[PDB]
Design an enzyme around this catalytic site. Sequence first.
Site, PDB file in Angstrom:
ATOM      1  N   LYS A 179       0.834  -1.205   0.000  1.00 39.35           N
ATOM      2  CA  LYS A 179       0.000   0.000   0.000  1.00 39.35           C
ATOM      3  C   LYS A 179       0.866   1.253   0.000  1.00 39.35           C
ATOM      4  O   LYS A 179       1.787   1.409   0.772  1.00 39.35           O
ATOM      5  CB  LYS A 179      -0.923   0.027   1.218  1.00 39.35           C
ATOM      6  CG  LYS A 179      -2.231   0.762   1.052  1.00 39.35           C
ATOM      7  CD  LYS A 179      -3.216  -0.007   0.219  1.00 39.35           C
ATOM      8  CE  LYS A 179      -4.671   0.417   0.340  1.00 39.35           C
ATOM      9  NZ  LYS A 179      -5.500  -0.528  -0.485  1.00 39.35           N
TER      10      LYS A 179
ATOM     11  N   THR B  26      -3.785  -5.642   0.647  1.00 43.09           N
ATOM     12  CA  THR B  26      -3.204  -4.319   0.889  1.00 43.09           C
ATOM     13  C   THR B  26      -4.141  -3.482   1.760  1.00 43.09           C
ATOM     14  O   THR B  26      -3.659  -2.668   2.530  1.00 43.09           O
ATOM     15  CB  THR B  26      -2.903  -3.579  -0.419  1.00 43.09           C
ATOM     16  OG1 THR B  26      -4.134  -3.266  -1.085  1.00 43.09           O
ATOM     17  CG2 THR B  26      -2.113  -4.464  -1.385  1.00 43.09           C
ATOM     18  N   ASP B  27      -5.449  -3.709   1.661  1.00 41.75           N
ATOM     19  CA  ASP B  27      -6.358  -3.059   2.600  1.00 41.75           C
ATOM     20  C   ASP B  27      -5.992  -3.381   4.038  1.00 41.75           C
ATOM     21  O   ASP B  27      -6.011  -2.513   4.921  1.00 41.75           O
ATOM     22  CB  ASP B  27      -7.802  -3.471   2.300  1.00 41.75           C
ATOM     23  CG  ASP B  27      -8.741  -2.581   3.108  1.00 41.75           C
ATOM     24  OD1 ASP B  27      -8.934  -1.420   2.695  1.00 41.75           O
ATOM     25  OD2 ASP B  27      -9.266  -3.014   4.154  1.00 41.75           O
TER      26      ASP B  27
ATOM     27  N   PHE C 139      33.147  28.669 -11.144  1.00 48.46           N
ATOM     28  CA  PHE C 139      33.290  27.528 -12.024  1.00 48.46           C
ATOM     29  C   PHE C 139      34.198  27.890 -13.202  1.00 48.46           C
ATOM     30  O   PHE C 139      33.808  28.461 -14.224  1.00 48.46           O
ATOM     31  CB  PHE C 139      31.927  26.990 -12.477  1.00 48.46           C
ATOM     32  CG  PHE C 139      32.002  25.611 -13.101  1.00 48.46           C
ATOM     33  CD1 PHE C 139      32.466  24.533 -12.368  1.00 48.46           C
ATOM     34  CD2 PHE C 139      31.614  25.377 -14.399  1.00 48.46           C
ATOM     35  CE1 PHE C 139      32.509  23.301 -12.979  1.00 48.46           C
ATOM     36  CE2 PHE C 139      31.667  24.142 -15.007  1.00 48.46           C
ATOM     37  CZ  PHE C 139      32.127  23.059 -14.268  1.00 48.46           C
TER      38      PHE C 139
ATOM     39  N   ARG D 200      29.260  33.661  -9.550  1.00 46.55           N
ATOM     40  CA  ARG D 200      27.958  33.304 -10.104  1.00 46.55           C
ATOM     41  C   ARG D 200      27.003  33.010  -8.948  1.00 46.55           C
ATOM     42  O   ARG D 200      27.389  32.894  -7.800  1.00 46.55           O
ATOM     43  CB  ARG D 200      28.010  32.097 -11.034  1.00 46.55           C
ATOM     44  CG  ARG D 200      28.521  30.835 -10.342  1.00 46.55           C
ATOM     45  CD  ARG D 200      28.516  29.614 -11.243  1.00 46.55           C
ATOM     46  NE  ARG D 200      28.755  28.413 -10.451  1.00 46.55           N
ATOM     47  CZ  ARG D 200      28.751  27.172 -10.891  1.00 46.55           C
ATOM     48  NH1 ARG D 200      28.532  26.889 -12.155  1.00 46.55           N
ATOM     49  NH2 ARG D 200      28.981  26.185 -10.017  1.00 46.55           N
TER      50      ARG D 200
ATOM     51  N   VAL E 171      29.862  22.405  -7.777  1.00 44.15           N
ATOM     52  CA  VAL E 171      28.882  21.702  -6.920  1.00 44.15           C
ATOM     53  C   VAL E 171      29.543  20.459  -6.316  1.00 44.15           C
ATOM     54  O   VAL E 171      29.356  20.215  -5.126  1.00 44.15           O
ATOM     55  CB  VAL E 171      27.610  21.373  -7.698  1.00 44.15           C
ATOM     56  CG1 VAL E 171      26.637  20.561  -6.865  1.00 44.15           C
ATOM     57  CG2 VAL E 171      26.938  22.667  -8.169  1.00 44.15           C
ATOM     58  N   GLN E 172      30.292  19.746  -7.145  1.00 43.97           N
ATOM     59  CA  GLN E 172      31.081  18.574  -6.766  1.00 43.97           C
ATOM     60  C   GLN E 172      31.879  18.775  -5.493  1.00 43.97           C
ATOM     61  O   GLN E 172      31.783  18.036  -4.496  1.00 43.97           O
ATOM     62  CB  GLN E 172      31.999  18.177  -7.930  1.00 43.97           C
ATOM     63  CG  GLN E 172      31.444  17.546  -9.166  1.00 43.97           C
ATOM     64  CD  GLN E 172      30.836  18.486 -10.204  1.00 43.97           C
ATOM     65  OE1 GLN E 172      30.605  19.651  -9.877  1.00 43.97           O
ATOM     66  NE2 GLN E 172      30.622  17.932 -11.381  1.00 43.97           N
TER      67      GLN E 172
ATOM     68  N   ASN F 223      21.713  21.770 -10.244  1.00 45.69           N
ATOM     69  CA  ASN F 223      22.233  23.128 -10.375  1.00 45.69           C
ATOM     70  C   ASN F 223      21.136  23.922 -11.106  1.00 45.69           C
ATOM     71  O   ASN F 223      20.974  23.647 -12.285  1.00 45.69           O
ATOM     72  CB  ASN F 223      23.571  23.199 -11.114  1.00 45.69           C
ATOM     73  CG  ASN F 223      24.254  24.554 -11.014  1.00 45.69           C
ATOM     74  OD1 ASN F 223      23.638  25.558 -10.654  1.00 45.69           O
ATOM     75  ND2 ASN F 223      25.549  24.649 -11.333  1.00 45.69           N
TER      76      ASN F 223
ATOM     77  N   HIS G 232      19.986  26.909 -12.808  1.00 46.66           N
ATOM     78  CA  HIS G 232      20.716  28.026 -13.397  1.00 46.66           C
ATOM     79  C   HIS G 232      19.938  29.335 -13.404  1.00 46.66           C
ATOM     80  O   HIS G 232      18.734  29.324 -13.658  1.00 46.66           O
ATOM     81  CB  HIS G 232      21.097  27.625 -14.818  1.00 46.66           C
ATOM     82  CG  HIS G 232      21.884  26.341 -14.910  1.00 46.66           C
ATOM     83  ND1 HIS G 232      23.102  26.167 -14.300  1.00 46.66           N
ATOM     84  CD2 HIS G 232      21.640  25.179 -15.551  1.00 46.66           C
ATOM     85  CE1 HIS G 232      23.567  24.947 -14.561  1.00 46.66           C
ATOM     86  NE2 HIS G 232      22.700  24.322 -15.319  1.00 46.66           N
TER      87      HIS G 232
HETATM   88  N1  LIG Z   1      -4.875  -5.483  -5.371  1.00 45.85           N
HETATM   89  C1  LIG Z   1      -5.790  -6.431  -5.546  1.00 45.85           C
HETATM   90  O1  LIG Z   1      -5.889  -7.172  -6.502  1.00 45.85           O
HETATM   91  N2  LIG Z   1      -6.759  -6.558  -4.482  1.00 45.85           N
HETATM   92  C2  LIG Z   1      -6.468  -5.550  -3.511  1.00 45.85           C
HETATM   93  N3  LIG Z   1      -7.461  -4.579  -3.244  1.00 45.85           N
HETATM   94  C3  LIG Z   1      -7.490  -4.395  -1.862  1.00 45.85           C
HETATM   95  O2  LIG Z   1      -8.210  -3.618  -1.290  1.00 45.85           O
HETATM   96  N4  LIG Z   1      -6.580  -5.215  -1.188  1.00 45.85           N
HETATM   97  C4  LIG Z   1      -5.861  -5.896  -2.212  1.00 45.85           C
HETATM   98  O3  LIG Z   1      -4.928  -6.573  -1.841  1.00 45.85           O
HETATM   99  N1  LIG Z   2      27.697  22.299 -11.893  1.00 45.50           N
HETATM  100  C1  LIG Z   2      28.728  23.114 -11.700  1.00 45.50           C
HETATM  101  O1  LIG Z   2      29.341  23.271 -10.664  1.00 45.50           O
HETATM  102  N2  LIG Z   2      29.128  23.889 -12.852  1.00 45.50           N
HETATM  103  C2  LIG Z   2      28.229  23.572 -13.917  1.00 45.50           C
HETATM  104  N3  LIG Z   2      27.446  24.618 -14.459  1.00 45.50           N
HETATM  105  C3  LIG Z   2      27.454  24.457 -15.845  1.00 45.50           C
HETATM  106  O2  LIG Z   2      26.866  25.166 -16.619  1.00 45.50           O
HETATM  107  N4  LIG Z   2      28.226  23.368 -16.258  1.00 45.50           N
HETATM  108  C4  LIG Z   2      28.659  22.738 -15.056  1.00 45.50           C
HETATM  109  O3  LIG Z   2      29.247  21.688 -15.191  1.00 45.50           O
END
Ligand SMILES: NC(=O)NC1=NC(=O)NC1=O
Ligand SMILES: NC(=O)NC1=NC(=O)NC1=O
Lengths: 295, 295, 295, 295
Positions: free
Chosen positions: C10, C57-58, C159, C176, C227-228, C254, C256
């Site tokens: 669920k 799942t209910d 950069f 930047r 960023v690295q 990033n 921009h």
């Molecule tokens: N997923 C199903 O095929 N039946 C399901 N509906 C529910 O409400 N419980 C299940 O397990």
């Molecule tokens: N991600 C960064 O630190 N610099 C980055 N900006 C860019 O435009 N190219 C890069 O790799």
Amino acid sequence: SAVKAARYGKDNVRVYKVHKDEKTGVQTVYEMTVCVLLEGEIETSYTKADNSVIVATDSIKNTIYITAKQNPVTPPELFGSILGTHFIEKYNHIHAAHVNIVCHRWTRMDIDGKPHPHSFIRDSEEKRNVQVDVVEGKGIDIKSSLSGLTVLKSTNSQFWGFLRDEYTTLKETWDRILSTDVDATWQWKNFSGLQEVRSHVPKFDATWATAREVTLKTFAEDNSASVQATMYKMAEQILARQQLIETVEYSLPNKHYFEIDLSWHKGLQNTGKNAEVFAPQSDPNGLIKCTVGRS
Amino acid sequence: SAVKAARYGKDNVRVYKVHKDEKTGVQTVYEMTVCVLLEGEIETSYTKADNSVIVATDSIKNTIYITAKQNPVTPPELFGSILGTHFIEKYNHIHAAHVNIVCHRWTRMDIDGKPHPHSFIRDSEEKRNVQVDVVEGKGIDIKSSLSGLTVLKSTNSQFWGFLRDEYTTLKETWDRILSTDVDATWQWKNFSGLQEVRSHVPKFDATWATAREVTLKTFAEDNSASVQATMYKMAEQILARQQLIETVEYSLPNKHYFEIDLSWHKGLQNTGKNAEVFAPQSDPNGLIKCTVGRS
Amino acid sequence: SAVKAARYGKDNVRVYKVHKDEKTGVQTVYEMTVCVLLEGEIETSYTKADNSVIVATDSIKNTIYITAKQNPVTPPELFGSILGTHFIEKYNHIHAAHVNIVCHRWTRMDIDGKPHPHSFIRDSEEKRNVQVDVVEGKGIDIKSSLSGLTVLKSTNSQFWGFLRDEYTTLKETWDRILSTDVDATWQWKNFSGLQEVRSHVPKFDATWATAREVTLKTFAEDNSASVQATMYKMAEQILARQQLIETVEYSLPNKHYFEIDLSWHKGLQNTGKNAEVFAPQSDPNGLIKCTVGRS
Amino acid sequence: SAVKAARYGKDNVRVYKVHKDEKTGVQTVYEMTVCVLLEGEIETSYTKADNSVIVATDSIKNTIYITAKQNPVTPPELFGSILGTHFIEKYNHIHAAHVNIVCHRWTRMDIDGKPHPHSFIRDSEEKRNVQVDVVEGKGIDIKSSLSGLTVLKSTNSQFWGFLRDEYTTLKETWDRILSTDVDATWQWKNFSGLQEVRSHVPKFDATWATAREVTLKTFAEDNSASVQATMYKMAEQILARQQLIETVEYSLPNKHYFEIDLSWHKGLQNTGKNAEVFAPQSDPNGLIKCTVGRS
Ligand SMILES: NC(=O)NC1=NC(=O)NC1=O
Ligand SMILES: NC(=O)NC1=NC(=O)NC1=O
Ligand SMILES: NC(=O)NC1=NC(=O)NC1=O
Ligand SMILES: NC(=O)NC1=NC(=O)NC1=O
């Protein structure tokens, strides 16, 4: 101080309904998301802590499900009118109901060329929407729309002849990509009430279909002078084909695709007529709106 | 301390490419989003502030556009292999390239029953993806997938016979709604390098198509005993139809649609065989995964 | 065909818990989102339609609420260990439990300089997370993390000195903007079981705090070479301050911010040392990852 | 057909500005997202393909950056007024400018109890917004708002005394959780133009601060009778503390947290006064709106 305006209700009510044909064994499903906001003589809930005037939003939610159980949920224009009319008829102090519905796509699957009786696919995120305003003594106002229809044409769009001054850097072009997400709304003439809405029920799906078709064909066929010019063409046609429409509004972003200059690398030619690889731009975007009505 | 693992690159590189047929006038577009992460003898950029070993991520982005300009971008399995091979051949100290590609739908529009030469629609949010790992002296590993395929069947799903103890409240059922978002991955046998990948190029689109078809038809036709049982059936077929696939993996949420008891209101009957209106549940959801391989 | 791997459970189980101090009247709230996936002798649910091996799942969802009712939900490392241990002890055929928890911020409000006894604010979208893997006969493996911590420094990032070839267009810079969303994970030494996890409970919150502090102070004080280089500095310190940590991993985009050349307009100077207005870029973004361990 | 209304411009323009104090070495950053939509004598761009009346949206974007370069960008109410006034003074045929600004948080970091000179944190997703409408011959209308302020109180919320009929299932309560996302707008009296806006500049930040404080303290201290009652209290205070405000509007969802009945399991008591574990509900939600003005 004074309450100048107030509305309250329930939002994001998800609803599924299935229709089952005994005869054929064919099933049909509907899924929507519903918002209902009420107005009335409810100011004292705000000013005096008087909850007696409040129809609990929990009860509004209940009402949505019960109404869907007892009425058709399609076309959404009808279902919204039925739901809003309920609130204003039922409660003496409630005088307006605002219903918004988003209709989600569940398209029947075709398996082996045959349509399947009970399996569906969300074939797109495009929505069909309605806004229905039900106002005591002033009828029913309906705005219908499609939204989330995303399109692109790779040529036959132009943009030249625009104003040029010291803020302008954009170059004129006679060939560009045009891409947008269509938001189109058609506003119906006021209806006097439910009977009148029920008498026009076949027109709702037909007009949605027409608005869609015109939108698609005009976008594809127009050698567009600009977004402005092209969208005016769509609005005009829809108005020409459905007389119960008073206005059509379009809201169209221009989702830009920029050329990329690669000449710095081995003289690679990727601009103008050699333009093959483009960078789609997430933002900013042009936004162009028009409301077209009858002359 | 010591660098145990390191990779760096550029994500969310959006790319559009258009192909134009002089002859026919027909245009075809491709749009993808690309991620490229590199591994190699680059630990000193982390430990010593030695940027000499760094191929700037800005240059990685440039490389993506240039490669798209000079090579086919379809099928994505080929384009990813070409892009990753570039990095490891080009730079002596770079020994692995990881390329992820998301392919976005641009489906040709049909206007008046005729396919349009240059207008497209995003007909769904379903994606076609590839993950390509290019490793010096160990070939090219490709995982292909489809994702975002949303489906629903309104009957012919069951769930009974599960474990029952003091934590269990779920009732057995012989008729329920089943809805999911399909994530399916097929892992290819290792390829020795680009020549080998190029020799199998027709299989990539064919297998994507087959995986899609099988997924759809099995979901629609299986009178499902559970999500587990149904997804095993899909995986088995795909493996049977493409021998160059080593494994198939599926990841399927169970998006619950709950019955709504309306009997408290005027004895309204909306459960079991009278169930017509349901509440789609946004959360929580079942999540079922399987990896199926060859015996 | 054969099941090579399988897990099910669920997802997106939202949980709120309140703690109320009778004595002081002070209330404290906890909100999390929980995922639990189980592994075991369950292949026949996939291959034979045997649901007898399935813990619904209910029921999994039910178990999450009951466990939260009967145990502390903080620190999340403890609660996840208790929840996963339950599944493998309770069910003879279930041999691994995978628990993921996202802890949401509800920070006590200060009103008039006084902390309020029962009112809270979501002061940021930053999350505290745990991944807990409970495996029969192999103990409890815990990965703790913070995510969604968004920061910016407006100077003291550099950069220069990177590889320059025919794919390079980026200019070296000695000043930047640097902005990122921090994802940092610390992996604990394997624990033999619940007793051992309970003996180390005070270390979990302390180490989260330390990882946060070091991350913040190093980002702010380092005259970053890339960023690295900067992220290596953070990882090294955390490892130095908590001996029960085997590895630290960082994943840093990033994001921009591009200069904008306005010289075309009235000779306006907005680049280099005159740079005042910048265009934040939504995509693409650099992505830099490191896993640092002990020498 | 006829153009009834039309506006066009640029959306999602992201802007960063840094301010650098030579003297102190302290840097201060601003980040916003800007929308500018223009109205005027532009109907022929729609009807006649006349682009001569169009100020390209690309030029609008340029103008935003240039204006930010040459003017203060804070308070946003001032910057929006300056930007909109530009368009209507500059272009004879443009008679209204609509400027929307979203201000993003970049809060100075404190490291070792000392505020850092150039490092910032996005301490929350809460926004400060302005909508500025500049209309030729009708001055400048400004709506200021805060949005995305998410709060919860774990007790001292009530809801009883509401209407009860055959659609009602909700039980009255004298103790519940109340959680919301605050959207609050204050509308200024019309300003005659830029001089008038500049004369009131100190009031903009002060009033934003007051609206925030009142919102927070009232939510925390009110033993709330309902969302309606509590929000009226906030609106009334703000109006009392700033005379240049004509109206205050609030839009507040009710994000429900449901009790969970665990009595089916070993008689576990988790309701009413024993309620400790709750299920946060993603949807549906109550939605309550109020506009409060002067008596
Ligand atoms: N997923 C199903 O095929 N039946 C399901 N509906 C529910 O409400 N419980 C299940 O397990
Ligand atoms: N991600 C960064 O630190 N610099 C980055 N900006 C860019 O435009 N190219 C890069 O790799
Ligand atoms: N919004 C409130 O103050 N009380 C509400 N909660 C509900 O469930 N119904 C209401 O009307
Ligand atoms: N929206 C259009 O039709 N053309 C537009 N693209 C731009 O870049 N500026 C415009 O005004």
